[PDB]
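Lecture 7, part B: from sequences to assemblies.

Below are the input chains for today's worked example.
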Amino acid sequence: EALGMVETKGLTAAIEAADAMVASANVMLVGYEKIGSGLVTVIVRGDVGAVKAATDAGAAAARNVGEVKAVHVIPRPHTDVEKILPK
Amino acid sequence: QEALGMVETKGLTAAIEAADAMVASANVMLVGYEKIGSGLVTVIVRGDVGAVKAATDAGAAAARNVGEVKAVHVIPRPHTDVEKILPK
Amino acid sequence: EALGMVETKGLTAAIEAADAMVASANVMLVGYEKIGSGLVTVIVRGDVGAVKAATDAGAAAARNVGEVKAVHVIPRPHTDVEKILPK
Amino acid sequence: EALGMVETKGLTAAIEAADAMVASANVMLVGYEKIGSGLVTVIVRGDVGAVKAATDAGAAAARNVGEVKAVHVIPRPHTDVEKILPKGI
Amino acid sequence: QEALGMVETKGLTAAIEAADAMVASANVMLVGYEKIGSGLVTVIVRGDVGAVKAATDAGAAAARNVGEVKAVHVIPRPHTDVEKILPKG
Amino acid sequence: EALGMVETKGLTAAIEAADAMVASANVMLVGYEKIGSGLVTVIVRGDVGAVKAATDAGAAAARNVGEVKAVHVIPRPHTDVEKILPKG
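Predicted structure of the full complex, as structure tokens:
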């Protein structure tokens, strides 16, 4: 299934993105990934339509709270990338 | 679903002061702190919407005199149980 | 009991703050915390009077070594010391 | 075998680089490394031709998501893959 | 107790040079390096006050020719057990 | 034996420095050290001449990939290489 990502500088904006994503569409919250330097990536899974709507809503909600650094949807991930995603 | 409140600061002393100011009222529960690097610390609380709004306002007011406030936000009705919504 | 904090930019100023605090008053060193951006917090505990004298001395000594970002005393922490402090 | 690297500022661009690298050629994803300043390196291994094609595709895909800081191929690593790579991949 | 000497750099190469110059200049024991992130590294030495003052001065002078020195300090007489003021790791 | 260091901003630059350094038989790769702020140090050992040529080659290869932050050779390290180097 499709992968959706919203990356912020600041955790409060990432929490807000996570909540707005799960509220807006039928997506599963995979989790948060912290890479340091204040950067937090919120990851969601679901059908491509649901993931596109959820990432759009999560990015729009996060921008009202803090800094959004990246927003992206991978409609059909290659099976080899599940290895680098947070459990 | 009880409300979630966040006060995110640059500086730990500012975050501890925000935590202490927030828990100073009986109906506000401290969930914990989260560190993400770049000196950013988030203090997370839970309780009734009104109690969380008053707590985050008080937490940000206390933190700003010690360090910098980066974010202040209340989620009145978090989706799922707060545990799924919150980082590990 | 009271909590005292001296937060510096860099570790050297923080170690000097820790030593000046224990030299000046009857306080216990809880530890050092790191949060990134070179920020280090030295945390002490004891009676309010001792913590006020220690933090004042700690900040004064640290300023001669590096940058002091914050100095603060919480006379009566509103929850358990272990619960108000980060893990 | 050849080593391929795509280093981005931010994780989202790195995940996109990883996905595009494995989709574009017969390469194995070794993993990702974090070094601070928001820098994330995605590392692949395989035949030189496959690694060159994969890194080119990974960098092109990552640039549409975020900032690409470095793209590089080591065709024949001098010491064993595990030796020249840092411990936690 | 024994004196503590510290040289804090931004960059590990300057810290290694400080550590080598500190142990070469006087009868001091290298305690170790402390990394706090943000590229900051503190080199800590222990020994007699005179030896520590000479060693820290030499360590800072040598490190400045390699990279950035952020702090230089000597604690002549620690006011509690050295294990209590030194960070855990 | 001598110690050589090439410190870069960027891991790709550090891996390229490491590969260039070990491209000659009498240079041993000790390892990498990360300290945050994107700074990575590649450490080598061997005869002073081999280490000087290795660090010069490591810095030259790394600079075309990312930034070189430090390049240094210690011809005669005091104590053994392990007592002067950080734990990891």
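Note for the exam: The domain at 1-88 of chain F is CATH 3.30.70.1710 (Alpha-Beta Plaits). Keep this in mind when comparing with the next example.
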